[PDB]
Amino acid sequence: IHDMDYPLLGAMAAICSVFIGGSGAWMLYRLDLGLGYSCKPHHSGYAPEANSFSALSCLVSGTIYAAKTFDFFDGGGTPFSFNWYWYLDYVFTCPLILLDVLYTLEIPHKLRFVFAVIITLWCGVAAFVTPSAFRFGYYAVGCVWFVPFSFSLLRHVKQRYQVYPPKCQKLLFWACTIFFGFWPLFPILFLFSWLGTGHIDQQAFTIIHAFLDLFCKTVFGLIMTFFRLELEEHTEVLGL
Amino acid sequence: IHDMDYPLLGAMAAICSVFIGGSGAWMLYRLDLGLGYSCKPHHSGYAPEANSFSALSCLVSGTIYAAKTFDFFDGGGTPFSFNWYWYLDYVFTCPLILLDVLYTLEIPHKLRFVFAVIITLWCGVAAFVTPSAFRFGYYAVGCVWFVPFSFSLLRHVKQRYQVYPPKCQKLLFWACTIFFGFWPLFPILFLFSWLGTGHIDQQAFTIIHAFLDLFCKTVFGLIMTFFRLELEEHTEVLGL
Amino acid sequence: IHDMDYPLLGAMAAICSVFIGGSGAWMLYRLDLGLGYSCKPHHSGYAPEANSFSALSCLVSGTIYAAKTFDFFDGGGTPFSFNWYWYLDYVFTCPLILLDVLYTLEIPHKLRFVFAVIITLWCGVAAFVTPSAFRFGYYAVGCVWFVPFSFSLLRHVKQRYQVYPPKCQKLLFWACTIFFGFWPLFPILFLFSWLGTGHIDQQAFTIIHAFLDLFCKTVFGLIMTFFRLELEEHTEVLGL
Ligand SMILES: CCCCCCCC/C=C/CCCCCCCC(=O)OC[C@H](COP(=O)(O)OCCN)OC(=O)CCCCCCC/C=C/CCCCCCCC
Ligand SMILES: CCCCCCCC/C=C/CCCCCCCC(=O)OC[C@H](COP(=O)(O)OCCN)OC(=O)CCCCCCC/C=C/CCCCCCCC
Ligand SMILES: CCCCCCCC/C=C/CCCCCCCC(=O)OC[C@H](COP(=O)(O)OCCN)OC(=O)CCCCCCC/C=C/CCCCCCCC
Ligand SMILES: CCCCCCCC/C=C\CCCCCCCC(=O)O[C@H](COC(=O)CCCCCCC/C=C/CCCCCCCC)COP(=O)(O)OCCN
Ligand SMILES: CCCCCCCC/C=C\CCCCCCCC(=O)O[C@H](COC(=O)CCCCCCC/C=C/CCCCCCCC)COP(=O)(O)OCCN
Ligand SMILES: CCCCCCCC/C=C\CCCCCCCC(=O)O[C@H](COC(=O)CCCCCCC/C=C/CCCCCCCC)COP(=O)(O)OCCN
Ligand SMILES: CC(C)CCC[C@@H](C)[C@H]1CC[C@H]2[C@@H]3CC=C4C[C@@H](O)CC[C@]4(C)[C@H]3CC[C@]12C
Ligand SMILES: CC(C)CCC[C@@H](C)[C@H]1CC[C@H]2[C@@H]3CC=C4C[C@@H](O)CC[C@]4(C)[C@H]3CC[C@]12C
Ligand SMILES: CC(C)CCC[C@@H](C)[C@H]1CC[C@H]2[C@@H]3CC=C4C[C@@H](O)CC[C@]4(C)[C@H]3CC[C@]12C
Ligand SMILES: CC(C)CCC[C@@H](C)[C@H]1CC[C@H]2[C@@H]3CC=C4C[C@@H](O)CC[C@]4(C)[C@H]3CC[C@]12C
Ligand SMILES: CC(C)CCC[C@@H](C)[C@H]1CC[C@H]2[C@@H]3CC=C4C[C@@H](O)CC[C@]4(C)[C@H]3CC[C@]12C
Ligand SMILES: CC(C)CCC[C@@H](C)[C@H]1CC[C@H]2[C@@H]3CC=C4C[C@@H](O)CC[C@]4(C)[C@H]3CC[C@]12C
Ligand SMILES: CC(C)CCC[C@@H](C)[C@H]1CC[C@H]2[C@@H]3CC=C4C[C@@H](O)CC[C@]4(C)[C@H]3CC[C@]12C
Ligand SMILES: CC(C)CCC[C@@H](C)[C@H]1CC[C@H]2[C@@H]3CC=C4C[C@@H](O)CC[C@]4(C)[C@H]3CC[C@]12C
Ligand SMILES: CC(C)CCC[C@@H](C)[C@H]1CC[C@H]2[C@@H]3CC=C4C[C@@H](O)CC[C@]4(C)[C@H]3CC[C@]12C
Ligand SMILES: *C/C=C(C)/C=C/C=C(C)/C=C/C1=C(C)CCCC1(C)C
Ligand SMILES: *C/C=C(C)/C=C/C=C(C)/C=C/C1=C(C)CCCC1(C)C
Ligand SMILES: *C/C=C(C)/C=C/C=C(C)/C=C/C1=C(C)CCCC1(C)C
Ligand code: NA
Ligand code: NA
Ligand code: NA
Ligand code: NA
Ligand code: NA
Ligand code: NA
Ligand code: NA
Ligand code: NA
Ligand code: NA
Numbered sequence A, B, C: 001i002h003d004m005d006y007p008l009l010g011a012m013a014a015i016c017s018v019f020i021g022g023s024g025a026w027m028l029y030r031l032d033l034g035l036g037y038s039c040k041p042h043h044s045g046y047a048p049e050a051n052s053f054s055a056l057s058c059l060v061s062g063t064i065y066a067a068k069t070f071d072f073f074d075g076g077g078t079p080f081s082f083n084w085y086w087y088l089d090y091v092f093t094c095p096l097i098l099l100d101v102l103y104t105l106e107i108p109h110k111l112r113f114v115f116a117v118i119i120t121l122w123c124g125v126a127a128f129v130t131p132s133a134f135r136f137g138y139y140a141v142g143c144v145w146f147v148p149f150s151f152s153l154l155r156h157v158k159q160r161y162q163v164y165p166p167k168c169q170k171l172l173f174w175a176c177t178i179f180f181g182f183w184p185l186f187p188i189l190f191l192f193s194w195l196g197t198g199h200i201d202q203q204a205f206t207i208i209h210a211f212l213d214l215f216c217k218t219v220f221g222l223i224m225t226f227f228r229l230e231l232e233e234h235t236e237v238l239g240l
Helices: A006-031 A049-073 A094-105 A110-129 A135-160 A166-182 A185-192 A202-235 B006-031 B049-073 B094-105 B110-129 B135-160 B166-182 B185-192 B202-235 C006-031 C049-073 C094-105 C110-129 C135-160 C166-182 C185-192 C202-235
Strands: none
Touching: A006 A049, A006 A202, A049 A094, A049 A202, A049 C110, A049 C135, A094 A110, A094 A135, A094 A166, A094 A202, A110 A135, A110 A185, A110 B049, A135 A166, A135 A185, A135 B049, A166 A185, A166 A202, A185 A202, B006 B049, B006 B202, B049 B094, B049 B202, B094 B110, B094 B135, B094 B166, B094 B202, B110 B135, B110 B185, B110 C049, B135 B166, B135 B185, B135 C049, B166 B185, B166 B202, B185 B202, C006 C049, C006 C202, C049 C094, C049 C202, C094 C110, C094 C135, C094 C166, C094 C202, C110 C135, C110 C185, C135 C166, C135 C185, C166 C185, C166 C202, C185 C202
């Protein structure tokens, strides 16, 4: 039950908020500094509108983990708790992470992809709060939205993986590893959680997701940031 | 009260999810196939961004009816139930249906119209959960947003009903019949429901709305899809 | 506690809904009338898409105050009550007010600014419902998002305050006074409220916020409307 050693989870949540939140703040600073590695002024002058999704996803996640930190240190149940409804926080963060990939890579069908992940996460929120055997009904519906989304999105990334120069491809390889290697790791964790098989307790479930958000938001956002800097440093700083 | 024969409503909800959800899936397949009846590749190559609203509205509604199916078969009240808050589901579906009309017909004031329907539905959600005599206060406020919206939107459709060729006008006539003939049928049903006059019980209220969503989303979405195909088959496949 | 003389607050809420709601309705009428003071037809023909934020913010606020009026006159606690969760209503209105400034003045970073105010208000909603000493944790996180937002947004406004002619600058001065003089007055009120210091009771807290919304939405929206009319009357009606 809710015997999760909140001081440990509150301390863990505080670290995630600082590192995830701090990483987002750093990315905002780098946005309004230049185009690529060189301090070349932006064509519009301030920054492209679509370059802030990597920074915003970490800032929003860092803020949400700050809310988690308050909830844990408050002793457990709180009127405004992101820990009560699992995957509810990811509803407002995954679209930003996804939009970072779509706009950075110029992947079409940006409207369909965003809806496919929002509904995927909402099915997770509904699956979590359902105490009956129908919790896997919502889970199945979520996978129906997710599997075509991941496979369809993967195909688009492969198409545009070729145009980029080999130097940028190395950075895009590690972004793909996190995006296509860690995102499908959340539904797997659901099956093995206390709601599913039972091999992962709630306290350990929070800790693992804390590390997943570090890679999915901070590490992934920084990789996208440096991929973008490398992309601009080669495309619009000296030609081609 | 809540004596609604959930097995009947769950079975009905399952049919709606498959047909509405399946219709949305079919429309997605047709999008990435060609411009019109002929398999002419799209100008952008994949598809226009605004052609997915018809498909997304049915997919979202089909997913929501899947959630309704779980709620009904679970025995009634569920922690994640779309049946507890009536008209809450339409908040996330009507804008998609409306945006299908606005972008397909290129009707201006797309920002005002979307807000007018979202507030209209929210007043319905508030009107439903209010047990006091003020439930008609929210209903009246909803109609204040709806009547100018329907009349103002109707005027715009009449303006652009003339430019389209007679073959496309026939398809637009039936889209207008559903959009301007069934949408005002929901507020009428509210007055005659158990909350209003009392002539429609809750069980019958769900069944009627199930059929309305079949016409408002599946039939309407398909009519828009074929109107779009007919429009493209005449405008950007052979000239004018 | 909840001894707030609801008939007084309901009567006050009704006045705000009519004046704020009515002002938004008036601004919609002026939009589809002409460009500036003269009745010059719009370049697009109907209206720019970004000119409706001033009208929509008042219409949404007027509608929400109508919901508040029902909640107060119903006797207090209501299933659909905007008065139970303070600052929840501002989540759906402040972005519209902010977007009015951003699009009217063409301030870049429109995506970052909107997120900075939505998270700022959500921290206020969480801060309000928290009964523990951590209510100031959410408040502090909200100020962390707000102070950089207000200072960063202020710098942008100063940059574009110079290009406009002196006649338009006078109208922009009073918009800045409300935007940068009243917005920071809400967090100050939180500290002195019954949740903070204790010098402002809940009944007086509602009355003060009623007057703040009159200036922040109605007066501010009208100033933006006339600033826009003055701007168009000088830029795209006779040249420069
Ligand atoms: C359910 C939660 C889902 C979360 C997703 C929310 C994020 C929404 C994604 C926004 C997509 C916007 C596309 C960005 C790329 C556009 C690039 C561009 O040109 O920008 C257009 C222009 C900026 O550039 P200009 O100054 O015109 O520069 C051109 C001259 N140099 O305006 C824009 O940036 C587009 C609009 C900006 C945002 C408008 C508001 C949209 C909503 C914001 C977030 C709120 C929704 C999330 C709700 C939070 C929970 C309640
Ligand atoms: C309260 C619930 C309300 C529900 C409404 C949500 C739907 C929001 C409507 C989105 C409007 C977008 C306009 C679509 C037409 C634009 C056509 C276009 O050119 O697309 C721009 C470009 C795609 O094309 P490019 O690759 O640039 O192609 C050009 C080169 N060939 O990007 C776009 O599609 C625009 C932005 C895409 C979506 C961005 C995210 C917006 C939010 C998504 C839905 C989430 C909100 C609903 C919340 C769900 C409940 C929590
Ligand atoms: C969490 C609550 C946050 C609230 C914020 C919601 C507001 C979202 C802001 C929308 C930003 C749109 C930018 C407006 C400027 C664009 C100007 C423009 O050219 O418009 C594009 C074109 C209109 O013009 P055309 O007919 O192409 O004219 C060109 C030929 N003369 O389309 C548009 O207006 C852009 C898209 C319109 C809105 C699409 C739907 C977006 C969502 C609407 C609000 C719903 C979200 C709020 C949720 C409410 C709570 C559940
Ligand atoms: C119901 C209307 C919902 C409308 C949306 C409003 C937003 C919700 C804001 C929080 C209000 C919560 C009030 C709950 C009252 C206290 C209940 C409580 O104690 O909490 C839990 C139950 O309630 C919750 O925990 C509800 C938490 C809701 C949190 C949802 C957060 C959504 C915010 C969106 C943010 C978008 C991203 C921006 C970042 C924000 C950073 C702060 C335990 O319940 P008890 O009453 O003790 O009963 C059990 C004891 N026998
Ligand atoms: C309060 C914070 C709200 C913040 C938003 C969070 C989203 C809500 C997700 C569901 C959490 C529900 C937890 C409720 C706990 C159980 C309560 C319950 O049993 O259910 C009902 C009451 O609660 C409900 O039914 C609440 C249902 C909320 C559903 C709202 C769905 C919104 C989702 C948006 C989706 C956007 C579109 C994507 C498609 C999704 C497809 C799955 C009966 O109440 P009891 O406690 O039995 O009391 C009566 C017994 N004497
Ligand atoms: C929980 C799922 C949330 C999902 C979103 C659904 C939207 C919520 C719509 C309102 C449903 C409220 C049902 C609450 C059941 C009654 C509870 C009640 O009596 O009210 C309060 C508690 O509940 C509330 O007050 C919840 C109010 C939620 C209002 C949130 C409004 C959000 C709407 C967004 C609108 C977007 C802008 C458009 C303008 C709309 C204009 C109408 C007092 O509680 P009692 O049960 O008496 O317990 C105390 C007695 N010992
Ligand atoms: C430790 C406390 C202050 C929180 C710091 C969190 C953020 C701000 C820190 C954590 C790790 C940091 C990154 C570590 C390594 C690099 C590589 C270097 O070539 C550029 C800076 C960059 C990308 C750093 C930016 C700042 C960073 C993202
Ligand atoms: C493949 C796509 C198109 C269809 C997806 C159908 C999914 C949602 C269906 C297939 C089998 C179904 C499950 C079959 C049996 C049960 C047992 C019951 O006591 C609870 C519901 C539950 C667990 C069902 C939930 C819904 C379910 C998982
Ligand atoms: C559990 C996790 C960490 C490991 C799984 C990582 C997976 C997702 C990684 C490992 C190898 C990667 C692939 C390596 C090569 C290519 C070819 C390129 O043209 C498109 C991307 C694509 C197809 C990558 C997609 C992501 C990928 C499949
Ligand atoms: C019965 C089960 C499989 C659910 C099927 C639901 C969806 C996929 C079905 C229901 C009715 C079907 C439509 C029936 C008639 C036509 C007209 C034809 O000229 C093109 C296909 C089209 C438009 C069909 C597409 C698929 C469709 C929309
Ligand atoms: C026409 C526009 C601009 C104004 C709309 C005003 C509407 C919202 C007003 C007009 C008359 C009002 C009703 C008058 C009397 C009552 C009885 C009371 O016990 C509950 C509220 C209720 C039912 C009111 C709700 C609000 C109401 C319906
Ligand atoms: C109860 C329902 C099914 C029947 C009511 C259907 C109504 C909404 C239908 C019946 C006839 C239709 C009208 C027929 C002709 C025109 C002229 C055209 O230039 C614009 C659309 C317009 C104005 C239609 C709007 C929709 C309409 C009024
Ligand atoms: C009193 C009742 C009807 C509610 C009226 C509310 C709205 C519609 C009223 C309140 C104050 C009014 C404004 C008062 C002064 C002016 C200045 C004038 O040069 C143009 C009209 C304008 C801008 C008015 C427009 C209508 C207005 C905004
Ligand atoms: C400046 C930025 C980057 C960091 C902001 C840190 C804020 C959120 C920190 C600084 C000091 C903290 C407070 C320190 C002590 C307490 C007492 C405790 O019983 C409740 C929480 C509370 C009230 C903390 C809430 C969070 C807090 C306000
Ligand atoms: C409590 C409230 C009502 C009074 C405080 C009003 C403040 C916010 C007002 C008073 C004077 C105003 C400043 C007057 C002059 C300028 C210079 C211009 O180039 C940019 C705006 C700017 C910088 C204004 C910003 C808003 C401002 C600082
Ligand atoms: C930073 C957080 C991220 C990137 C979270 C991603 C989460 C998912 C891809 C979750 C997917 C799920 C499904 C496929 C179905 C079942 C429920 C979920 C929510 C675990
Ligand atoms: C697929 C579902 C659709 C198209 C639903 C449409 C619903 C409406 C137009 C509802 C309108 C209402 C009002 C006019 C006021 C009172 C409340 C409503 C919600 C019934
Ligand atoms: C019409 C209403 C408006 C313009 C409301 C504006 C509200 C704010 C700027 C609120 C700000 C807050 C913070 C800075 C932190 C603490 C909580 C708030 C919500 C009071
Ligand atoms: Na957000
Ligand atoms: Na994936
Ligand atoms: Na990727
Ligand atoms: Na949705
Ligand atoms: Na209508
Ligand atoms: Na129509
Ligand atoms: Na709204
Ligand atoms: Na400010
Ligand atoms: Na301003």
